[PDB]
Amino acid sequence: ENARLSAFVGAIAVGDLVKSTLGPKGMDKLLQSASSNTCMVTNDGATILKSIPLDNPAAKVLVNISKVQDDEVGDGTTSVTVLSAELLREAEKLIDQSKIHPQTIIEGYRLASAAALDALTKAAVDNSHDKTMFREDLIHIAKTTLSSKILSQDKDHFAELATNAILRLKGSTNLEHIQIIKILGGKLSDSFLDEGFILAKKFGNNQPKRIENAKILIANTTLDTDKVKIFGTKFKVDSTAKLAQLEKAEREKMKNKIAKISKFGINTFINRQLIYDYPEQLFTDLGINSIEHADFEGVERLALVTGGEVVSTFDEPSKCKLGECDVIEEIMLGEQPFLKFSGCKAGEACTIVLRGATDQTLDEAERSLHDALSVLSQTTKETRTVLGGGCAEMVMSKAVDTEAQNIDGKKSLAVEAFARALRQLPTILADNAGFDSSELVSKLRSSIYNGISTSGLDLNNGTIADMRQLGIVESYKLKRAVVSSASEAAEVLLRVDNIIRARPR
Amino acid sequence: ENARLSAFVGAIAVGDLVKSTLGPKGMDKLLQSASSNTCMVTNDGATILKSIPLDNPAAKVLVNISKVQDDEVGDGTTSVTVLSAELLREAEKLIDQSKIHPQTIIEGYRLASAAALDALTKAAVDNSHDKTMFREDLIHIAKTTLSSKILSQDKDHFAELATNAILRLKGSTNLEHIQIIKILGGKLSDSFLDEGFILAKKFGNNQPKRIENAKILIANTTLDTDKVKIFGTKFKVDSTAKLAQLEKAEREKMKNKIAKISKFGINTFINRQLIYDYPEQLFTDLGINSIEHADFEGVERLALVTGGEVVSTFDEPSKCKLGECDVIEEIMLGEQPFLKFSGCKAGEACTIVLRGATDQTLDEAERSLHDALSVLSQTTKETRTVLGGGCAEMVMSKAVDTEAQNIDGKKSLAVEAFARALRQLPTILADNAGFDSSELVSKLRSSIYNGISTSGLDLNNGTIADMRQLGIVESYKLKRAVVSSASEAAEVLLRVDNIIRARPR
Amino acid sequence: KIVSKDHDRFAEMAVEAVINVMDKDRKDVDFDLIKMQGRVGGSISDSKLINGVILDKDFSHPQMPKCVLPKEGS
Amino acid sequence: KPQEVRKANIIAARSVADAIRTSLGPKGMDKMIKTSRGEIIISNDGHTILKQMAILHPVARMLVEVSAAQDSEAGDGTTSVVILTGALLGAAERLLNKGIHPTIIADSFQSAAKRSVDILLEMCHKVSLSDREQLVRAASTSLSSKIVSQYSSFLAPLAVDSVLKISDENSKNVDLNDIRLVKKVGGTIDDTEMIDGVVLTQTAIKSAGGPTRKEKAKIGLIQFQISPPKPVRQMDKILKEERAYLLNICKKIKKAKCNVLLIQKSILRDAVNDLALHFLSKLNIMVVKDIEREEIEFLSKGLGCKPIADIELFTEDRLGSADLVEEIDSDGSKIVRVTGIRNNNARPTVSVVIRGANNMIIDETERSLHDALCVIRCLVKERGLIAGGGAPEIEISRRLSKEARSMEGVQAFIWQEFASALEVIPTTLAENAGLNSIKVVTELRSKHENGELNNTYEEHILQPVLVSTSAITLASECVKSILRIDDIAFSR
Amino acid sequence: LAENSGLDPIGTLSTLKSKQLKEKISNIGVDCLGYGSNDMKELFVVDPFIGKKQQILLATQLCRMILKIDNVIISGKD
Amino acid sequence: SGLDPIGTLSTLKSKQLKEKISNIGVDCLGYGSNDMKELFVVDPFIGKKQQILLATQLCRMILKIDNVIISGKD
């Protein structure tokens, strides 16, 4: 039990050190040394935790976790430790009243964290308004990155393709939504923009070049040339022809899995390996298309834009997550076969085709493009804020109460306690600012409980006021960064049942 | 500092002895003496508490609470201390992290108990179904109580008046809703049931005996000749006519009190004392009739049938609780005028007029009628049960959560803390049952939250089942007796800021 | 572990590695024939299945080419 | 008990304030402190007491930083700021018992300090620097606390005329570190030379060949030192190597037209070789060696020059400008003076020279004139003057007591306790003078009702307004930094 | 009485003084029953003048008598 | 897995006798349902066979030693 107490009582005692320092009106702390003449005073939470020597082996783990927030972003480092300490206060009450492995309680935090992120999205605002001023700055910054790069030949043509490849995304900025197709024997000025998912090495011979209402399924199997290495296995046969009969009997059992493919209502099947002529010929009568050379990367990028999933096995027929594309066009350019996928439901993606004169110009253009798009796409999550002043903090609290309706018997207290920790943020801010936490939070939750609540925490008048009129907002990137860091920080301490005392120095 | 611990934590140890003894499967306690050969084993809660000497001076308060509960009914005495212990256990969080005034917490219980009793009433069932057999047996029971009483002369006519005096109430069965009038010069066989609220005295002289569309207002004041004792005063005046000037000045001030009455638009007034001719003569032009000699019950019972208020003062003009009645008829029987009201809005009551031949028959008939009506009124609180097995305990938590929605900041944590103690009753009952209490109570709240209000916990199968099919019910009178006893016991204990040890007798 | 997101990539690496080091006769795998090497930095998506020794080298002087010539169809 | 840890620091802080409280004023009680090294010192100055007290308490050391800024900014009130700091700590003890959070206590001090300044400026008489009769009588009263009295009449215009040249207009903060009091052996108090250009701390070369005087000279700052290398045909071989090394340095000096150069004093090796003085004697280049390391940063500001570490980077633009450079010795001083620098970036930095026979003369005179420059510095940054002795503190407590009803909530009660915390300064002055404590305080509220600032004006007691303003401002930040500490732990 | 009524004793004291100064001169005390604002005069709650005057006279006389005893002499038991 | 060890063990024994002989294990990680055969979760038999042989070999070496002799530290 002391293993958890050292990670709870020991962490809360250390966590309460920087807890009162949250906010500009928070408390302060002095750091005293042995000689006492080297001391200093500061409000930094990360400095106080790292400077104070602690023989507690559980406290040293929290120090390494806080370093991730500084390197990734570097904002709100103190808020991560304060929120992580409040999660331990509720988790300690769940354990002592249970004495069951916390890993089950950890599963309740993952389901509750999903509802908190969805509640912040609907109420989120942005500074993206008047895109006409932001679009003119986006093309100018991209031309600066093109310096020293071979792409500097024509800045207007290359920056225009990157402009329509960002604002038209309307979604995640990850590079997995941008396909890079590069060919040889072409000019850089001939590059064009395409919204389709483009392959090479066209599939099939007698297969048609036009497919309407195509479905996408991901699977891994080898239907051609099984038994890769036959050396070393004892072969006892009366005739030589019986050797090939064993390979046909193994592929004969695949007919049940092939029959389940037609039951899925799909006209196209994707496989990484090849397919023998007999199972491929049956695909024509059943209307099944066989796509080859899907590799791995292109498989993951296709399932995300089409809303599909990837699996190497069949768990049960008529259960899966499938994508679709309306029109598939097969053309040929640059003396190489190409493929084109279009008509995807809610498809959001783009493809930039760069034509180089050699292999050296292709690798330098692809690496320089990712560095230029990463800086431009960084402003999407930057400057975007949400309504602050305890409002959004309470919105995450009432969103967990929705999950508290349908819940398991033993998972209810795990989810319900997560909402109590979210309400500890206005309690700490009210105590550090010199106000009554019990009076403000009580009136704050009753108003935000059902509907039409713009109210928030007002520290000037010492009461609950509307934050939209005062103009109090906080960044949305800071919201997700602290919640995701505090959720992973609490898992590290709970997943450790026994903590061995560290070697004293 | 230690007074709160002895009144809260110290009171828990007293309730811990009766905590595990609740229920047929509950545990037992041991009472051991110095000789140890006189001991015994029993589950009785009242015996264990009275036998063990208690050095805790705050524990003697709960001793008198169990004695009051035993007078009402000999069942549920153990559950009173257990329910009161859960309210004191949660009082620790009401101090440290709450800081809420204790009386405001007690006032929050009155608002929660009001919704808890109303929630149990709608969900209460009874064996009164097929009232044809139930209503017929009511007159036969009343005839058995007529033994040794002068009412035994005629069983059919006298018991019929007592039967209709109960079911026709449609409300509280207490004798405060029944009026008894003792008169002379008649026979007991001529008595009949009349709801017209007959009283002895008359009112008015030249005023008519019939009033249509009457407005009744109840107030208590002396408008005629205050300071009834004139002995000892000294009147210093220059002339005899100047002495009457002070009395005439009071008559001019009477218009201020009459103006507030005239603005209410009432033709009927209620006064306990008399009224001088001048303020009574002004009521003739306004058509205001004043009733005199209303005693005490006549003041309270008039506000119950007419929907009035018992306050004697006006806190603001044109705001008050007003009643009304269709027709006020004045008749004369037995050489005395009677007052029979007619057309009272939502009036529910009955008045049994006992007409005797002497004073000895009036006192014996009134005392015998109260004993006969007590048996009929007992059938309303007897045999009427509610769904048990965690059902009724969880339903009360839903009504508390309704009040917990709209609440101020001080009582927000007080009302919410009361809902936690309601779920502790099925938790403790599931402790000694050998099953998991945390899983059964959790799944019970989510089921009743949306629909399915009749569900409960099954002790045999350890799951949620229909209480109507299993046939497990608990008396409704027991539910109100425990809540009323716990509300009065916790009202005194929470107000305790210090402990004064009682003097040993 | 977080690796469970990319697990589909690491699944195909162990299929071809065991077949080469193990023969169907004895059906045994030697621990000395499996070189386990890792470094700090990068990501888990860049892991590739190599059929031979890594032997990290900077090629000494930078003038040396990054590829080995066939030496006239040798 | 997170607050009880802070309450233990508040009680320990009030014990230090009560010890300094007895030392307020010239009639205050002195404190005897015996250092661990065996040195025995005593004085009534609160800044010197807390400096050698060696306080090991973490919170109590905040008074040392405030007392250091009190003398650096205002220059007066280092003792009174400690009493005012302890007054708010004593009143905060009753505030914690009522359930008041220190944030409201700390935030109310910001509004209370800014309000006390605006009230004080209304009763203060605004004065201008154009009137020289007010500055003479202001600095003359500060010299009445020292043994020198009749000879202090000539020192009054000395400090006034030095500030008026560098005052200009809208100068805001004026650093007095550029004004240095030169202490030399010999002379008298009545003998003083302003030398507005600059004054060094060292003499000139007494050897043969030194010109000791030059007309139209450029004085640079060179941290280097000309010495033979210090990491028997053999005799002449060493001389040819040493003379060539000493000449190569002098070759770039002639091409740079350097009349006067400086050499940093180094006790390790030799400063300037005797052969180097004879080499530059033919070139008519004055040499001044043994320059103190403390004056290196001083000369880098008033002269507008920059230090030259290496001869390779030495240029002409880093030199100075001097019209005439001569050595004038009244008696025994042998000091070099410079006049008419006329630098655009640099300003007229004036160094006051003080002459005296006994050691106790130039010492007590230095501390007396240093406080006189601080009082004049207060009038430059903030105009106006008030009567000292706790007179304005009585009326401020009266106005804030009536205006406390205009507020609402918990903050309204703080204004009532803040008015009582300002009455400790005039009460201590009445206690240390032997007069009855409560009797004199009652006479202050009685007389200040009818009259306004009316007698210390006849007694020539004038306290600058910036001292009373900075005393409240620094105390508001000092008490705030105390209550904001809720705990302390070992950190190393 | 403000602490026994569940109100801020310092905030209520400053509130009662502000309502009796800038608005108008009246008598508004601490609320014995739960309400939302000041001006209990509407409830017609009155106290006797001779009763309140007798309290301040005995409290003043008691404070004077306590200051007149500077020593506590308690004899032992036999 | 956070479940009743006795209540779960009685369930696995009842499904393999009255219903039919099959393999149904305890799920440590949350899955869809029981009957891992539907999820195609397989474990090596010789791998589990090597565990029960080393377990009996380790249990014997513990019981075969009735004496504990050790010297001191200098």
Curated annotation (Swiss-Prot), chains A, B:
BP GO annotations: chaperone mediated protein folding independent of cofactor; protein folding
- Cellular component per GO, a single term: chaperonin-containing T-complex
Give compartment(s): Cytoplasm
Q: Which UniProt keywords are present, listed alphabetically?
A: Acetylation, ATP-binding, Chaperone, Cytoplasm, Nucleotide-binding
Q: Which PROSITE patterns match?
A: TCP1_1, TCP1_2, TCP1_3
Q: What is its main location?
A: cytoplasm
> Which Gene3D superfamilies does this UniProt record tie to the protein?
GroEL (3.50.7.10), GroEL-like equatorial domain (1.10.560.10), TCP-1-like chaperonin intermediate domain (3.30.260.10)
State one molecular function term (GO).
ATP-dependent protein folding chaperone
Q: Which Pfam families match?
A: Cpn60_TCP1 (PF00118)
Report the sequence similarity comment from the record.
Answer: Belongs to the TCP-1 chaperonin family.
Q: Quaternary structure per UniProt?
A: Heterooligomeric complex of about 850 to 900 kDa that forms two stacked rings, 12 to 16 nm in diameter. Interacts with PLP2; this interaction leads to inhibition of CCT complex mediated actin folding.
Q: What does this protein do?
A: Molecular chaperone; assists the folding of proteins upon ATP hydrolysis. Known to play a role, in vitro, in the folding of actin and tubulin. In yeast may play a role in mitotic spindle formation.
Q: What is this protein called?
A: T-complex protein 1 subunit beta
> Per the UniProt entry, what species is this protein from, by scientific name?
Saccharomyces cerevisiae (strain ATCC 204508 / S288c) (Baker's yeast)
Write the lineage as a comma-separated list: Eukaryota, Fungi, Dikarya, Ascomycota, Saccharomycotina
UniProtKB/Swiss-Prot annotation, chain C:
Q: Which residues of the parent protein does this chain contain?
A: 191 to 264 of 562
Q: Which organism is it from?
A: Saccharomyces cerevisiae (strain ATCC 204508 / S288c)
List where the protein spans the membrane. none
* Annotated function: Molecular chaperone; assists the folding of proteins upon ATP hydrolysis. Known to play a role, in vitro, in the folding of actin and tubulin. In yeast may play a role in mitotic spindle formation.
Q: Where is the protein situated, by its record's location annotation?
A: Cytoplasm
Family designation: Belongs to the TCP-1 chaperonin family.
Descriptive protein name: T-complex protein 1 subunit epsilon
Quaternary structure, from the entry = Heterooligomeric complex of about 850 to 900 kDa that forms two stacked rings, 12 to 16 nm in diameter.
The opening ranks of the lineage are:
Eukaryota, Fungi, Dikarya, Ascomycota, Saccharomycotina
UniProtKB/Swiss-Prot annotation, chain D:
Q: Which UniProt keywords apply?
A: ATP-binding, Chaperone, Cytoplasm, Nucleotide-binding
Predominant location of this chain? Answer: cytoplasm
User: What's a GO cellular component annotated to this UniProt protein?
Assistant: chaperonin-containing T-complex
What InterPro entries does the database record attribute to this sequence?
Chap_CCT_delta (IPR012717), Chaperone_TCP-1 (IPR017998), Chaperonin_TCP-1_CS (IPR002194), Cpn60/GroEL/TCP-1 (IPR002423), GroEL-like_apical_dom_sf (IPR027409), GROEL-like_equatorial_sf (IPR027413), TCP-1-like_intermed_sf (IPR027410), TCP-1_chaperonin (IPR053374)
GO biological process: any one? protein folding
Q: Where does this one sit in the cell? A: Cytoplasm
Q: Name one GO molecular function term.
A: ATP hydrolysis activity
Q: A Pfam family this protein belongs to? A: Cpn60_TCP1
Nucleotide-binding recorded as keyword:
yes
What Gene3D superfamilies does the entry give? GroEL (3.50.7.10), GroEL-like equatorial domain (1.10.560.10), TCP-1-like chaperonin intermediate domain (3.30.260.10)
- Is ATP-binding given among the entry's keywords? yes
Q: What PANTHER family does this protein's entry cite?
A: CHAPERONIN
Instruction: Name the job this protein performs.
Output: Molecular chaperone; assists the folding of proteins upon ATP hydrolysis. Known to play a role, in vitro, in the folding of actin and tubulin. In yeast may play a role in mitotic spindle formation.
Spell out the family assignment given in the record's similarity comment.
Answer: Belongs to the TCP-1 chaperonin family.
Q: What's the further remark here?
A: Present with 5530 molecules/cell in log phase SD medium.
Can you state the subunit structure given in the record?
Heterooligomeric complex of about 850 to 900 kDa that forms two stacked rings, 12 to 16 nm in diameter.
NCBIfam families per the record?
chap_CCT_delta (TIGR02342), thermosome_alpha (NF041082), thermosome_beta (NF041083)
- The identity of this protein, by name, is T-complex protein 1 subunit delta
**Taxonomic lineage:** Eukaryota, Fungi, Dikarya, Ascomycota, Saccharomycotina
Swiss-Prot record, chain E:
* Organism of origin: Saccharomyces cerevisiae (strain ATCC 204508 / S288c) (Baker's yeast)
Q: Which residues of the full protein are shown?
A: 483 to 560 of 562
Family to which this protein belongs: Belongs to the TCP-1 chaperonin family.
Q: Where in the cell is it found?
A: Cytoplasm
Top-down, what is the taxonomic lineage of the species of origin? Eukaryota, Fungi, Dikarya, Ascomycota, Saccharomycotina
- Quaternary structure annotation from Swiss-Prot or TrEMBL: Heterooligomeric complex of about 850 to 900 kDa that forms two stacked rings, 12 to 16 nm in diameter.
Superkingdom, natural source: Eukaryota
Protein name per UniProt: T-complex protein 1 subunit epsilon
Main role? Molecular chaperone; assists the folding of proteins upon ATP hydrolysis. Known to play a role, in vitro, in the folding of actin and tubulin. In yeast may play a role in mitotic spindle formation.
